[PDB]
């Protein structure tokens, strides 16, 4: 179903894999998707994250507290956690419910919030944001460009 993803949505996905690599994780989790959303930049959810007072290095470090780097770098692809799997499912599902047929970075952020049970959401609330906060906020964004 990844063919629906926009150029930058997919770029988020590739980036999430690089984040989980160089922080030495054997899985891509809800955090690493947040990380890739940030690291993306030119697209929606990244500017959305610099607006609601969330930056890259904060999430990096928060993960290095609750997760911390791994002893041994993994190579080859890095599998999703069931949390990340559900986030991507729901990103699809959000996208469809807002009418679009593509899936952009903003739709991954919405799916992420929808899951709200895993590390991404723990990290977010720890940094200074809220789930329906950023949801309604990014919805206002799709209303404001």
């Amino acid at each position: 179903m990844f063919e629906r993803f926009t150029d930058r949505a997919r770029r988020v996905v590739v980036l999430a894999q690089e984040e989980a690599r160089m922080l030495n994780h054997n899985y891509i989790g809800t955090e690493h998707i947040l990380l890739g959303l940030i690291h993306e930049g030119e697209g929606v959810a990244a500017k959305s994250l610099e607006s609601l007072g969330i930056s890259l290095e904060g999430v990096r470090s928060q993960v290095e507290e609750i997760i911390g780097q791994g002893q041994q770098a993994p190579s080859g692809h890095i599998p999703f956690t069931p949390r990340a799997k559900k986030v991507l499912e729901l990103s699809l599902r959000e996208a469809l419910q807002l009418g679009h047929n593509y899936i952009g970075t903003e739709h991954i952020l919405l799916g992420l919030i929808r899951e709200g049970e895993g590390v991404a959401a723990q990290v977010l609330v720890k940094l200074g944001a809220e789930l329906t906060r950023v949801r309604q906020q990014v919805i206002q964004l799709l209303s404001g460009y």
């Binding site: 179903m1 990844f2 997919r10 996905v13 894999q17 692809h77 890095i78 999703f80 991507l88």
Partner: peptide
């Protein structure tokens, strides 16, 4: 789609 990379 949906186990890893862009699968």
């Amino acid at each position: 789609w949906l186990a890893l990379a862009l699968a």
